[PDB]
Every structure is written in structure tokens, then in C-alpha cells.
RNA sequence: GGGCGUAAAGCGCGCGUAGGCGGUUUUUUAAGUCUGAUGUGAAAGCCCACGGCUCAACCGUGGAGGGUCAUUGGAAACUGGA
RNA sequence: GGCGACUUUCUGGUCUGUAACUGACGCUGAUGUGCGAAAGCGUGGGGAUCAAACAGGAUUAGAUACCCUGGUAGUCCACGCCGUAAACGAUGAGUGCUAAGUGUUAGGGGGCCCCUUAGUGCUGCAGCUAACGCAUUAAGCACUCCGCCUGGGGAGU
RNA sequence: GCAUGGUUGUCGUCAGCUCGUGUCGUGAGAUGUUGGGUUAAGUCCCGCAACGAGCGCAACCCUUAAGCUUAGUUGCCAU
RNA sequence: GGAGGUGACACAUGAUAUA
RNA sequence: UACAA
């Protein structure tokens, strides 16, 4: 019913996360990209990674990792990023250079806020309290608006439902509005809980 | 400061072209246990948000309850609509002999000793409004001595 | 300033202050010593919201033109009588005026 | 210590008997009313106090209470009688 | 309950003013006794219109109806009976007290207006009410008497 | 798929649906959002115990219809 | 503007709880 | 959905 807010704005006011060109090796490079994105998600699942950008040029892959906690990705003395770079050069057989970009104010990042809620829901936290706390935090940091939604068997109820909260303005029809969006899943004993977060900075 | 007690939480519904739209009504009594009591109501889709609205509204209609050594100066019946609450002074050993929302109102007023009977509607909002009505009409001896132009001793 | 409204509409509570009825000029002088646009609902009781519009007026042209013009008086009295001085004609209620001036 | 416009509940409406109730004042009475006295309201019981049961139940002792009771002396505002 | 052309005869009640008179002679009212729309019943008249029943014609899947054409009782009168209605203001009677404004009916007093009685309407405070609303014609505030109610159905059987 | 996440159809591009504060109501609720006009539109103005706000409408995005500057190949061809 | 009086072709049906 | 037919 409601279009993905990111997908509607891709190539309009939002940039592609994959920045390379190819014609006949497009499929092979696309799936090497997806191989890398799956590797980074698994290997840095505790490092608060918002998103990953991939640039390709001259048998070299430049990977930018936007992370809430950059000291965990780099590691004490650059040792953790050297180990990840060595494993990426084995998944790829190309020369990978990794850049790390700290994202201050992790409470204004939809992906980090969505995954934090999902992690708390897995710890049996109140599906209401986690949404309200996340909204209060983002608005205190100057967010123009925020919307949260948790869908599924809330609190182990036998009948699934969706509870959503909002504050400020989240103008999903305004094309020029840069609306950050993310979906995350919480693995509970009762199945999947879907977390959706919309953040509008301005 | 003021202590507050949630007397009743009611889920109410209004019907629309779809199904039903639900809200939550909170009836709350506030009081300091030192002769100032008040009740308020608030409505919201969330129970805690309705409570805060009810608490805030209660602070705007605090009442001054006359007392003599922890008891009321005389018997009274408070009536609001169908609600009617009989209140009688009791000895200091006696506790608050009250049934429902009356107990919340009298306790937060600072009574600790009273004989009360709810003779009428048991709907909590109207029982609460009846209780406040009876406390609003209590008169201490020093006040009625002033209006009659006598001293307190001459009243007896 | 002492000829009030017609007899067929005079409030009964203005009998002391009062063809047509003529106000108590003698009583108004002793009372006077004791003492333009639409009134927005909640001007006084909703200052938590009006001040935002007052602040937003200080800080668009279409809004300001009506805002400047903006920022019979029964709305105002309730905003004040519920919070716990004014010319009170015969048709007006005197029991809700702290300092009633019984002048036309 | 409740009600009867619409929730159960005003007879369809008169006339009128018994009964109930009844305007102001003065005098009088003393049935109601009020206030004492005397007698009586058994004992056991209930309640209070004390004593005996190791405690307690229980038992015992001394009080209190319970009448619309009767008889008798006063009061006279109200209800009743003249 | 009801009462609507006009005339005469017989007859009931109410209202206003006055303050001759009587001097509490009052209020209510179980039982009781009367009056009581329409339909209906009896006897006897009358019979225009309308019209249960009924007949025919339509409509309809059917139409024992609604619509059309007729039509009997009845509708009318007298004298008896019946005694029931959403017989309603769904509000018993009596008495007094409690803001105003404004129509109207029948009077009176004073200078068309002001005051005042008694009815009849609308609006509207205080108060009352569950609300709707009532509000000097109370559903307000009081006293007296009567009637009546105590979950729905069964059953006003 | 009547335990679910995600994704989709449908009413339906219908113009509506709400919230905060205030105020009115014992209360469910109401108001705002109704009324006078106007619009494709809860679009806009006026009045109004409402004042504001949000999700919607619209606008910001793509393309099509006209012109200008830059550029002239693999496009075009007037001298 | 709101009341009170006054007057003014045909279309049948849709099991129980749970909602 | 579980039923009924
Ligand atoms: Mg009862
Ligand atoms: Mg009665
Ligand atoms: Mg009925
Ligand atoms: Mg009834
Ligand atoms: Mg009657
Ligand atoms: Mg009857
Ligand atoms: Mg013993
Ligand atoms: Mg007459
Ligand atoms: Mg009588
Ligand atoms: Mg009788
Ligand atoms: Mg007849
Ligand atoms: Mg016929
Ligand atoms: Mg006949
Ligand atoms: Mg006859
Ligand atoms: Mg009746
Ligand atoms: Mg009466
Ligand atoms: Mg009366
Ligand atoms: Mg009225
Ligand atoms: Mg009159
Ligand atoms: Mg648009």
C-alpha cells in the first residue's frame, strides 16, 4: 500500500549505494557486491553498521562503512579493520580498500534505531516503551519528525497486530523530503516481529 | 506534594465507517492527605497518557476539607445526580469505613476515621462527585460562629 | 452615557442600577472610583497555544494580515470568571463583574 | 429510608359518606406531651467489673439494661376537650 | 367525555368590582353514587352521504389487502343498555411561597399608555432532572388527604 | 496466510481521517472538521470556543508541447 | 432562524456461536 | 474459525 520511502527517492534526491559501471559483467559484479554486503552484515553485526557503499574501479573495490561505533570496526590500533580487509580479499580476489565513517547521533539513524528496537524486543521489552523512548530521543536531537511501528504478535498475543507511534512531521508524499527509513526483524519465541522506523531530519 | 490514585480505567468506543475507535478514560483523585483533595478526568488511546491528563485536571479543582482532630465536623450527605454518599464523624480509633472511590477521596483528604455509606449510584465518577459535594458543604464551628455573630462557646 | 437599553429587554438584576431605562448616573460616579476585533476562544485559558501564535506573529503575509488584525464579550468573561472591571449596561449580567460600572 | 411527564406507577371525570387533616386570639382543662416519686418488669442469658478453673471455653459473684406497664405529685408551649 | 347556522323557552357554572352579611361553616375522600368518545346491543322509526362484511374489476409468485366500481349492518332520531379509549398535559386534588420578558381572552382602576384581577400561549433565571426537559398554568420550595408502583414473560390470563 | 515478518490487491486519487491544548457535557461524546460562498480537492476566503498541528489534496520528481545558451560526432545539409 | 396548528407499477428472503 | 445444510 505504502511505497518504500527509500525506493521512491532513489536516483531523485537519494544516491545509489552501488557506484560502478559495467555492461557484460553486470551480473557477476552485482552478486560479488551482494556477497560482500552479506559478509559485512554478518561479520559486523554488533558494530552498529548503518549502511555500506561500494565503489569499483580498476580491479579495486572501495568500501565505505557508515557505523555508529567506529572503534569496534577499526579495532584497537587498526587491527580489526585489517582482519576484515584480509577476509574481503579472499571473498573477492580483488584489491579492497575499506573506509570507515563515524555517524554521530545514532538516534537519528533509522537503521540503527530500528535494530535497537528489534534487539530490545528480543529481550522481552515492552513493544510500547521501546517505540516511545526511541521517538523521544530522536525529537530531542532536533528531528523534524519520527514514526515507529512494531508489527506481529505483540507481547506474545495469539492475534498479531500493528502498534505505531509518531511525532513531528513525516511527509511521505513530499518527494524532496529526505526521509530515512529502515525495517528490522526481532526473533522472538512467538515468531517474527517487524520494526519500521521513519525519520525526517530536514 | 500531592499523591494520586487511579480510581477507574474505562475503555470507551466510538463507531466509525470502519470498525470501532477505542480510547481510555482515567478517573484520578489527587490529594496531599492534609485537607486538600481533588479529582480529574483525562482521555487518551494510551492508559498512562490518560492518567497524566486526569492528574493534571485534578489539580485545578482542589477543595478545602474542614477537619476536627482527623474527623469531619458533622454528618453530611453529598449528592451529585444519582450519586449520594452519607458521611459521619467517627472516633479516632475507627478507620475509614468506606466502600470504593469514596475511600480514595477521603484518604487523600486526610480523614483516617469516618463512617460512610454510598446510598445511590455506584458509578465511580458520580460517587466521587457526590463525595466532593458533601465535603464542599461541611462547615467548621469557627466559620458558623462568625456568621451568627456569636463566639464559639455560645454556639453550645 | 446613562441611557440604557429598552424596557422590554432589561435584565432584572440592574434594578438598583436603573419608555427606555436610564442608568444611575449618581451611582456610577461613586462606582467609577472603585473600579476591537474578535476574541479568540482560549485567549487567556489557552496561552500555552496562543503565545505560540503570538510568538509566530512576532517572527506568511496572508497569515500576518489576519494575525495583526486579531492579535459580546461572553467568551472573555468565562476565560476570566473561571480563573477566579467593565461597563455593565442593563442587558448585561452584573453578578459576574467584580467592578461593575452601571453606565450606558 | 424510595417513588409515580417519557423508566413500573395519577382512578376517564364528578358528587359525596366514614375517616384523616385543618386559619387568628383570650380563658379553661389536662386525654396526648413533658418532668419527678413509688411499685413491678423472676432466675438464667446479653453487656461491664471482679473472682475460680495452669490459660481459654466455662463457672460464680456484683452491677447495668430491657415497659407502648401501672399508681401518684407537678408543668402548660404544642395536639386534643370546653 | 365534549360543545360551532340562526330564533325562542327552560336551566348549570365561571369571572370582575364592592365589603351588606354569616363567622372556619374548610380541604381531601375508602366504601358509595353518578356522568362518561367511538364501536356495539335491544325496541321502534328513519335512511341522503359514507361505509365494516360482501360482490365484481385490477395488481401480484400468491393479494383473503392497499387502488377502482358497487354495497349491507352501521353512520341519524327516541327510549333503555353497555362503561371502555394513546378517556393524554401519558403530569390527582387543595393551599401558600419563589427573577424576568412577551402575545392573547374577559374585566377593573388611573393618567393610547401605567397599574391590577382571572384565564390562555411562547421564551427564559433560581431550583429540579438520568437526560430530554419543567420552570408563578413547575416537573421548584413546602404542608394535608386520596389513588397507584416494587424486574421481564406467563397475564390483565 | 485463522499464529507471523515482508510484499500485494480492493473500496480508491474517494477527499477525507485524526491529534495536542483549550472549552462545553455527570457521561459516552462534542467542538475544531459546522455555517455563507468557492474549488478537481478539509482548495481558499469570511464568520465562529476555538487556537494550532499532523497524515491526506496540491506543490516538489519523470515525460510531452515553445524558445535561448553551451556542444557539432557516429547527427544535420542552406549557400 | 427555531417551534406549534393547517393543508398535501412493482422490489420476497438471507441458519449457530464466535466479530 | 468451528459448525449447520
Ligand atoms: Mg426505586
Ligand atoms: Mg404525585
Ligand atoms: Mg412505554
Ligand atoms: Mg410508564
Ligand atoms: Mg387524569
Ligand atoms: Mg382508561
Ligand atoms: Mg475456663
Ligand atoms: Mg361570568
Ligand atoms: Mg372533595
Ligand atoms: Mg373511588
Ligand atoms: Mg354510537
Ligand atoms: Mg370500497
Ligand atoms: Mg340503530
Ligand atoms: Mg342513547
Ligand atoms: Mg394511566
Ligand atoms: Mg400539586
Ligand atoms: Mg403550587
Ligand atoms: Mg422554559
Ligand atoms: Mg398568566
Ligand atoms: Mg500532488
Please check whether residue A2 lies inside any domain of the structure: no
Query: Which chains sit next to C, with 3 or more Cβ pairs under 8 A?
Result: none
Rounded distance between C-alpha atoms, residue C80 and residue C70, angstroms:
19
List all chains that touch chain A, counting a touch as 3 or more CB pairs closer than 8 Å. Answer: none
User: Do both A23 and A66 map to the same domain?
Assistant: yes
Residues A31 and A74 in one domain: yes
- Residues A168 and A143: their CA atoms lie apart, in Å, by 8
Resolution of the model in angstroms: 2.2
Whole-number Å distance between alpha carbons of B64 and C103 = 38
**B120 CA → D10 C1’, Å:** 26
Strand F: which of residues 55-114 in chain B lie with Cβ below 7 A?
Answer: 56, 81
Domain-located, residue A5: no
Domain edge (last residue) among A104, A125, A150? A104
CATH number at residue B132: 3.30.230.10
Both A181 and A199 in one domain: the answer is yes
Q: Is the CB of A171 under 7 A from strand F?
A: yes
Q: Which of A72, A104, A136 is the last residue of a domain?
A: A104
A75 touches strand F (CB under 7 A): no
Same domain, A81 and A144: no
Q: What domain range is B112 assigned to?
A: 76-147
Provide the grid cell at A139. 525529537
Q: Does any domain span residue A6? A: no
> What's the Å distance between residue B83 CA and nucleotide E36 C1'?
46
The verdict on A29 and A58 lying in the same domain is yes
Residues 1-60 of C with CB under 7 A from strand F: 38-42, 45-46, 48-50, 52-53
- Alpha helices, DSSP H, located in B33-152: 47-58, 101-109, 124-136, 141-148
Nucleotides of strand E under 7 angstroms from a protein beta carbon: 99-102, 129-131
Say how many domains are in chain A.
2
Of A74, A104, A134, at which residue does a domain stop? A104
Closest residue by Cα to residue A6 from A138, A176, A180, A170: A180
Q: What is the distance between the alpha carbons of residues A76 and B17, in angstroms, rounded to a whole number?
A: 61
Range of the domain at A78: 15-104
Cα(B85)–Cα(B82) distance, integer angstroms: 10
Q: Which residues of chain A (12-51) touch nucleic strand F at CB < 7 A?
A: 12
Cβ of B15 less than 7 A from strand F: no
Q: Report how far ligand 16's centroid is from the alpha carbon of B83 (Å).
A: 27
What would you measure as the largest C-alpha separation in chain A, in angstroms?
55
Give the burial string for B90-100 (b: 16+ CB within 10 Å, else e): beeeeebebee
The CA distance from B85 to B113, in Å, is 16
A126 belongs to a structural domain: yes
As a whole number of angstroms, the distance between CA A193 and CA A151 comes to 6
Residues A69 and A82 in one domain: yes
**Angle (CA) C36 C39 C40, round 5°:** 145
Helix, strand, or coil (residue A137): helix
Element (H, E) at A155: none
- Domain holding C55, by residue range, is 40-71
Query: Angle at the Cα of B73 (from B70 to B78), degrees rounded to 5?
Result: 105
Amino acid at each position: 500500500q505504502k511505497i518504500n520511502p527509500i525506493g521512491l527517492r532513489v536516483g531523485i534526491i537519494r544516491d545509489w549505494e552501488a557506484k560502478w559501471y559495467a555492461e557484460k559483467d553486470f551480473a557477476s559484479l552485482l552478486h560479488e557486491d551482494l556477497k560482500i554486503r552479506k559478509f559485512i552484515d554478518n561479520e559486523l553485526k554488533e558494530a552498529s553498521v548503518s549502511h555500506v557503499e561500494i565503489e569499483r574501479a580498476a580491479n579495486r573495490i572501495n568500501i565505505a562503512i557508515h557505523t555508529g561505533k567506529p572503534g569496534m570496526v577499526i579495532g584497537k590500533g587498526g587491527s580489526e579493520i585489517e582482519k576484515l580487509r584480509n577476509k574481503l580479499n579472499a571473498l573477492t580476489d580483488k584489491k579492497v580498500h575499506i573506509n570507515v565513517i563515524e555517524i554521530k547521533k545514532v538516534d537519528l539513524d533509522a537503521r540503527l534505531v530500528a535494530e535497537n528496537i528489534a534487539r530490545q524486543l528480543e529481550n522481552r521489552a515492552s513493544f510500547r516503551r521501546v517505540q516511545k523512548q526511541a521517538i523521544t530521543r530522536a525529537m530531542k536531537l532536533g528531528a523534524k519528525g519520527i514514526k515507529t511501528q512494531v508489527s506481529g504478535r505483540l507481547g506474545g498475543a495469539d492475534i498479531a497486530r500493528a502498534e505505531q507511534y509518531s511525532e513531528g512531521t513525516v511527509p511521505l508524499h513530499t518527494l524532496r523530503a529526505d526521509i530515512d527509513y529502515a525495517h528490522a526483524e526481532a526473533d522472538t519465541t512467538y515468531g517474527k516481529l517487524g520494526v519500521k522506523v521513519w525519520i525526517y531530519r530536514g | 506534594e500531592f499523591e494520586e490514585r487511579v480510581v477507574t480505567i474505562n475503555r470507551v468506543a466510538k463507531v466509525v465507517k470502519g470498525g470501532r475507535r477505542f480510547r481510555f478514560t482515567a478517573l484520578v483523585v489527587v490529594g496531599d492527605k492534609n485537607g486538600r483533595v481533588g479529582f480529574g478526568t483525562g482521555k487518551a488511546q494510551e492508559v498512562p497518557e490518560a492518567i497524566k491528563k486526569a492528574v493534571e485536571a485534578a489539580k485545578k479543582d482542589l477543595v478545602v476539607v474542614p477537619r476536627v482532630e482527623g474527623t469531619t465536623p458533622h454528618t453530611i450527605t453529598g449528592r451529585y445526580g444519582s450519586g449520594s454518599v452519607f458521611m459521619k464523624p467517627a472516633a479516632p480509633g475507627t478507620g475509614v469505613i468506606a466502600g470504593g472511590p469514596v475511600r480514595a477521596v477521603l484518604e487523600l483528604a486526610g480523614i483516617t476515621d469516618i463512617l460512610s455509606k454510598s446510598l445511590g449510584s455506584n458509578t465511580p465518577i458520580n460517587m466521587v462527585r457526590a463525595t466532593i459535594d458533601g465535603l464542599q458543604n461541611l462547615k467548621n464551628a469557627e466559620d458558623v460562629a462568625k456568621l451568627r455573630g456569636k463566639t464559639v462557646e455560645e454556639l453550645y | 452615557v446613562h441611557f440604557g437599553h429598552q424596557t422590554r429587554r432589561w435584565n432584572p438584576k440592574m434594578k438598583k442600577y436603573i419608555g427606555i431605562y436610564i442608568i444611575d448616573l449618581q451611582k456610577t460616579v461613586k462606582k467609577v472610583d472603585e473600579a476591537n476585533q474578535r476574541w479568540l476562544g482560549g485567549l487567556l485559558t489557552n496561552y500555552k497555544t496562543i503565545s505560540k501564535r503570538i510568538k509566530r506573529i512576532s517572527e506568511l503575509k496572508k497569515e500576518y494580515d489576519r494575525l495583526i488584525k486579531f492579535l459580546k464579550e461572553r467568551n472573555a468573561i468565562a476565560e476570566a470568571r473561571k480563573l477566579n472591571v467593565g461597563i455593565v449596561d442593563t442587558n448585561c449580567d452584573p453578578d459576574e463583574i467584580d467592578y461593575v460600572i452601571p453606565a450606558n
